[PDB]
Write an enzyme that holds these catalytic residues in place. Structure first.
Site, short mmCIF file in Angstrom:
data_model
loop_
_atom_site.label_atom_id
_atom_site.label_comp_id
_atom_site.label_asym_id
_atom_site.label_seq_id
_atom_site.Cartn_x
_atom_site.Cartn_y
_atom_site.Cartn_z
N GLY A 23 0.83 -1.19 0.00
CA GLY A 23 0.00 0.00 0.00
C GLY A 23 0.87 1.24 0.00
O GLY A 23 2.04 1.18 -0.39
N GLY A 75 3.96 1.80 2.98
CA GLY A 75 4.10 0.51 3.63
C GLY A 75 4.37 -0.67 2.71
O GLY A 75 4.33 -0.53 1.49
N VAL A 110 4.12 -5.31 3.32
CA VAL A 110 4.01 -6.40 4.28
C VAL A 110 4.48 -7.76 3.75
O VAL A 110 4.02 -8.24 2.72
CB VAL A 110 2.56 -6.57 4.78
CG1 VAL A 110 2.46 -7.76 5.72
CG2 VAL A 110 2.11 -5.32 5.51
N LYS A 124 5.63 -5.50 8.55
CA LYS A 124 5.27 -4.39 7.67
C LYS A 124 6.36 -3.32 7.70
O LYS A 124 6.73 -2.81 8.76
CB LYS A 124 3.94 -3.80 8.11
CG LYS A 124 3.49 -2.59 7.31
CD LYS A 124 2.14 -2.08 7.79
CE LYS A 124 2.14 -1.84 9.30
NZ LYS A 124 0.88 -1.20 9.77
N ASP A 145 -11.93 3.89 10.77
CA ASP A 145 -11.69 3.36 9.43
C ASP A 145 -12.03 1.88 9.34
O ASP A 145 -11.46 1.15 8.54
CB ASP A 145 -10.24 3.59 9.02
CG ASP A 145 -10.01 3.40 7.53
OD1 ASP A 145 -10.89 3.75 6.75
OD2 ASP A 145 -8.95 2.90 7.16
O1 LIG Z 1 -1.20 -3.14 9.66
C1 LIG Z 1 -1.60 -3.99 8.89
N1 LIG Z 1 -2.41 -3.65 7.82
C2 LIG Z 1 -2.84 -2.25 7.56
C3 LIG Z 1 -1.90 -1.56 6.58
C4 LIG Z 1 -1.79 -0.14 6.56
C5 LIG Z 1 -0.91 0.49 5.65
C6 LIG Z 1 -0.13 -0.28 4.76
C7 LIG Z 1 -0.22 -1.68 4.76
C8 LIG Z 1 -1.11 -2.32 5.68
C9 LIG Z 1 -1.19 -5.39 9.10
C10 LIG Z 1 -1.70 -6.48 8.45
C11 LIG Z 1 -1.05 -7.64 8.94
C12 LIG Z 1 -1.28 -9.09 8.53
N2 LIG Z 1 -1.10 -10.11 9.35
N3 LIG Z 1 -1.40 -11.30 8.68
C13 LIG Z 1 -1.77 -11.01 7.43
C14 LIG Z 1 -1.73 -9.65 7.26
C15 LIG Z 1 -2.11 -8.98 5.97
C16 LIG Z 1 -3.28 -9.43 5.31
C17 LIG Z 1 -3.68 -8.85 4.09
C18 LIG Z 1 -2.92 -7.81 3.53
C19 LIG Z 1 -1.76 -7.35 4.19
CL1 LIG Z 1 -0.85 -6.06 3.49
C20 LIG Z 1 -1.35 -7.92 5.40
C21 LIG Z 1 -0.14 -7.20 9.88
N4 LIG Z 1 -0.22 -5.85 9.98
#
Ligand SMILES: O=C(NCc1ccccc1)c1cc(-c2n[nH]cc2-c2cccc(Cl)c2)c[nH]1
Length: 344
Positions: A20, A23, A25, A40, A135
């Site tokens: 995104g 960020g 991940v 992340k 959100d």
């Molecule tokens: O903070 C998170 N997501 C919100 C976010 C905000 C800005 C940029 C990227 C993600 C986040 C997701 C996760 C995660 N844990 N297990 C799977 C995930 C995950 C699932 C779907 C998509 C992502 Cl990018 C990550 C850990 N932290």
């Protein structure tokens, strides 16, 4: 993969998951706990906005401790603020998020009921700390292989401030549009806990049909979709809207009748629809609260106030990092992440 992912020695075997803005991940192997985890990468120090959403989330997720809220297990960054360009957040690894599931999987009433319960159980904790998520949406809801739910992404979360909630008509807003409450487009700044409940309701409606309930294509269209189903707001609901430009727009609209939930959701559970109605209530003051949502008959087989903990202590007032410059935020992000460095 793609670009640099420098998560140090303790985490190995990187696999891309998704990204995104500011960020990215991946999943890695935690050699100290022998379990895979999610990491992340964050590069926010560019302009204040990124730093602002990064400080809030690190500050909140670090004080929050709840089964249905995502935690931060570790944070990796450089030993000095002057060497720090990136920041890595280590969090529980989850199989998927609710956004993916709804794309291909049909949910049973049991799954819908359990997912709804976990959302509210976690939202109750959040509001206990006097915090708004602001959100809430399927992609910010993570599930694991046994369907345990964890709310994530508190980048837009603010301390509740119901006394400074009022604003003009059609005021610009940042949160995701399909889950914006009616009053957002009318007279609300989004500083009331009733903002979150509405989104949950949108989520509950989306779980019933695998479709977004109010999919507006732009700012004002979002209000049209909502009014197209709840129908015209009553006189008493309209009298609470004191702002003239806001009230007159609603008045200038042709009379529309509310569409029955069981018309939209034929094979839905009656107890579910009744609660959906309480959550998707036009008048925010009437809209059902989270602790009432749990006590609702629909969540009866899960409801247990003794097993739904609240925050040890809330946030005193709104975080003043609102007009704080890029430099001071980086310094604060640096000070907040210190407990995770070895030389500490
Ligand atoms: O903070 C998170 N997501 C919100 C976010 C905000 C800005 C940029 C990227 C993600 C986040 C997701 C996760 C995660 N844990 N297990 C799977 C995930 C995950 C699932 C779907 C998509 C992502 Cl990018 C990550 C850990 N932290």
């Amino acid at each position: 993969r793609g670009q640099v992912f420098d998560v140090g020695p303790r985490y190995t075997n990187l696999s891309y998951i998704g990204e995104g803005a500011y960020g990215m991940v991946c999943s890695a192997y935690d050699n100290v706990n022998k379990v895979r985890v999610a990491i992340k990468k964050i590069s926010p120090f560019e302009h204040q906005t990124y730093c602002q959403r990064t400080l809030r989330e690190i500050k909140i997720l670090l004080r929050f401790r709840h089964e249905n809220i995502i935690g931060i297990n570790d944070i990796i960054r450089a030993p000095t603020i002057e060497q720090m360009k990136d920041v890595y957040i280590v969090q529980d690894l989850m199989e998927t998020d609710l956004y993916k599931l709804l794309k291909t999987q049909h949910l049973s009433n049991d799954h819908i009921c359990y997912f709804l319960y976990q959302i509210l159980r976690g939202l109750k904790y959040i509001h206990s700390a006097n915090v708004l998520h602001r959100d809430l949406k399927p992609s910010n809801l993570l599930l694991n292989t046994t369907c345990d739910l964890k709310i994530c992404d508190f980048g837009l979360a603010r301390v509740a401030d119901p006394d400074h909630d009022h604003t003009g008509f059609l005021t610009e807003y940042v949160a995701t549009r399909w889950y914006r409450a009616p009053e957002i487009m009318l007279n609300s700044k989004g500083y009331t806990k009733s903002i979150d409940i509405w989104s949950v309701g949108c989520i509950l409606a989306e779980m019933l049909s695998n479709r977004p309930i109010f999919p507006g294509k732009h700012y004002l269209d979002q209000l049209n979709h909502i009014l197209g189903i709840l129908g015209s707001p009553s006189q008493e609901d309209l009298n609470c809207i004191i702002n003239l430009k806001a009230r007159n727009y609603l008045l200038s609209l042709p009379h529309k009748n509310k569409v029955p939930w069981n018309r939209l959701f034929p094979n839905a559970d009656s107890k579910a629809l009744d609660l959906l109605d309480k959550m998707l209530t036009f008048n925010p003051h009437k809209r059902i609260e989270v602790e009432q949502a749990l006590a609702h008959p629909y969540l009866e087989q899960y409801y247990d106030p003794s097993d739904e903990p609240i925050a040890e202590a809330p946030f005193k007032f709104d975080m003043e990092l609102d007009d704080l410059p890029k430099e001071k935020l980086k310094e604060l992000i640096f000070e907040e992440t210190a407990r995770f460095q070895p030389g500490y």
